Design an enzyme around this catalytic site. Structure first.
Site, PDB file in Angstrom:
ATOM      1  N   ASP A 101       0.707  -1.260  -0.314  1.00 52.03           N
ATOM      2  CA  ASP A 101      -0.099   0.318  -0.348  1.00 52.03           C
ATOM      3  C   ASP A 101       0.392   1.490  -0.387  1.00 52.03           C
ATOM      4  O   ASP A 101       1.748   1.399  -0.058  1.00 52.03           O
ATOM      5  CB  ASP A 101      -0.973  -0.260   1.453  1.00 52.03           C
ATOM      6  CG  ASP A 101      -2.100   0.916   1.477  1.00 52.03           C
ATOM      7  OD1 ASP A 101      -3.169   0.197   0.673  1.00 52.03           O
ATOM      8  OD2 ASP A 101      -1.875   2.096   1.659  1.00 52.03           O
ATOM      9  N   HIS A 132      -4.145   5.929   3.544  1.00 46.79           N
ATOM     10  CA  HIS A 132      -4.597   4.426   3.750  1.00 46.79           C
ATOM     11  C   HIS A 132      -3.675   3.335   3.954  1.00 46.79           C
ATOM     12  O   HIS A 132      -4.977   2.663   4.866  1.00 46.79           O
ATOM     13  CB  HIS A 132      -4.661   4.817   1.747  1.00 46.79           C
ATOM     14  CG  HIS A 132      -5.655   3.780   1.366  1.00 46.79           C
ATOM     15  ND1 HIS A 132      -4.676   2.721   1.242  1.00 46.79           N
ATOM     16  CD2 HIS A 132      -6.639   3.450   1.293  1.00 46.79           C
ATOM     17  CE1 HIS A 132      -5.825   2.138   0.292  1.00 46.79           C
ATOM     18  NE2 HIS A 132      -7.145   2.338   0.734  1.00 46.79           N
ATOM     19  N   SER A 292     -10.829  -1.363   0.007  1.00 46.47           N
ATOM     20  CA  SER A 292      -9.708  -1.841   0.668  1.00 46.47           C
ATOM     21  C   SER A 292      -9.556  -2.134   2.464  1.00 46.47           C
ATOM     22  O   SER A 292      -9.201  -2.766   3.010  1.00 46.47           O
ATOM     23  CB  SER A 292      -9.133  -0.235   0.855  1.00 46.47           C
ATOM     24  OG  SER A 292      -8.207  -0.321  -0.399  1.00 46.47           O
TER      25      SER A 292
END
Ligand code: CA
Ligand code: CA
EC number: 3.4.21.-
Lengths: 352, 24
Positions: A101, A132, A292
């Site tokens: 990521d 994120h 996600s």
């Protein structure tokens, strides 16, 4: 014969960069010789080429920066199975959980001492860097808001400060995992890919090889309110493709879009209004939404299932995830009519 | 809304998602 593939989503294409995939049993020495031959034959025609990376571990081949004019020539190279033009992907205790990521805030109170930052970094240039990834690491193993509190995580950076990565960068990251494992084996591996690009033959093949090699892969179905089969790694069969649901048992709506659906989705998991580690400060929490987040819950459930039953095959782990999932709670009417039968009405759950 | 501590989030709202997956 050898075939050429480029991303069907034209704005996601990355022309000038090619993944040249060689036949299944091609040795590393042969892959280097084929790259040199391409450079040499390309030089005879007055073209300058750069070999950016040579693949070995899951998939033999190489990454080449060159003019697309050289493709017919490149397709005639011996050992060549197919060539794919690069494209973009985007952010969507005895078990080791790998995270591919964005950068992550490793000292966040929530994940401090549970996440190991690898030296792996392969990201495209930019057109909050860690928002994120940190939130996702927290969803998997966070002290207060985490699914598998006892899980240890290893993170690789494949997404830049905008949540943008490449298929080539992701392949290199997936190869890094396989290499680390051969160099220093441990217990069962869970590979979390909370990203998605258009359907990719090379990315699906890399995921398929990693899966056949015994490694468990969990991916985001995608937030395009579309069929998960047209996106990668979402479409890779042996991968665990996760859709997102909300507290009201509704498939998640993300503006004009929302969760992906269809036959390529294995199951759904909570993916709306998910509290987790905010990279804004060391004790900061924030609510986030997406496939996600949903995939991260499944990577945590799978980490705990594999910790309890370390001998589970990829197929047995899949059967356990389905068997323990909540049945028929999702509102099917949100999905396109023809997709209701094809989309599994499953919401991930831990064994009781 | 970014919260600077766990307690601050708890007062603002046992997250639904950890309940839904049967962790609690
Ligand atoms: Ca699957
Ligand atoms: Ca059904």
């Amino acid at each position: 014969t050898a075939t050429f593939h480029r991303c069907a989503k034209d704005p996601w294409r990355l022309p000038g960069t090619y993944v040249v995939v060689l036949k299944e049993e091609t040795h590393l020495s042969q892959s280097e010789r084929t790259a040199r031959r391409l450079q040499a034959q390309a030089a005879r025609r007055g073209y300058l080429t750069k070999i950016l990376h040579v693949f070995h571990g899951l998939l033999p081949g190489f990454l080449v920066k060159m003019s697309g004019d050289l493709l017919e020539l490149a397709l005639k190279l011996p050992h060549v199975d197919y060539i794919e033009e690069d494209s973009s992907v985007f952010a969507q205790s005895l078990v080791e959980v790998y995270l591919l990521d964005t950068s992550i805030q490793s000292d966040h109170r929530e994940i401090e001492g549970r996440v190991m930052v690898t030296d792996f970094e392969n990201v495209p240039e930019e057109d909050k860097c860690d928002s994120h990834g940190t939130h996702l690491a927290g969803v998997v193993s966070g002290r207060d808001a985490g699914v598998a509190k006892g899980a240890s995580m290893r993170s690789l950076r494949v997404l830049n400060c905008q949540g943008k990565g490449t298929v080539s960068g992701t392949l290199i990251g997936l190869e890094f995992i396989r290499k680390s494992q051969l160099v220093q084996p441990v217990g069962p591996l869970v590979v979390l890919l909370p990203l998605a690009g258009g359907y990719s033959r090379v990315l699906n093949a890399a995921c398929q090889r990693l899966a056949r090699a015994g490694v468990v892969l969990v991916t985001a179905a995608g937030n395009f309110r579309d069929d998960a089969c047209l996106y990668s790694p979402a479409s890779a069969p042996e991968v665990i493709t996760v859709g997102a649901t909300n507290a009201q048992d509704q498939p998640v709506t993300l503006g004009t879009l929302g969760t992906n659906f269809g036959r390529c989705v294995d199951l759904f998991a909570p993916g709306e209004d998910i509290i987790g580690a905010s990279s804004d400060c060391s004790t900061c929490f924030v609510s986030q939404s997406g496939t996600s987040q949903a995939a991260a819950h499944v990577a945590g459930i799978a980490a705990m299932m594999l910790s309890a039953e370390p001998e589970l095959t990829l197929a047995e782990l899949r059967q356990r995830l389905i068997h323990f999932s909540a049945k028929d709670v999702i509102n099917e009417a949100w999905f396109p009519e023809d997709q209701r039968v094809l989309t599994p009405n499953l919401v991930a759950a831990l064994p009781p | 809304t970014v919260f600077t501590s766990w307690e601050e989030y708890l007062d603002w709202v046992m997250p639904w998602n950890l309940v839904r997956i049967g962790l609690l």
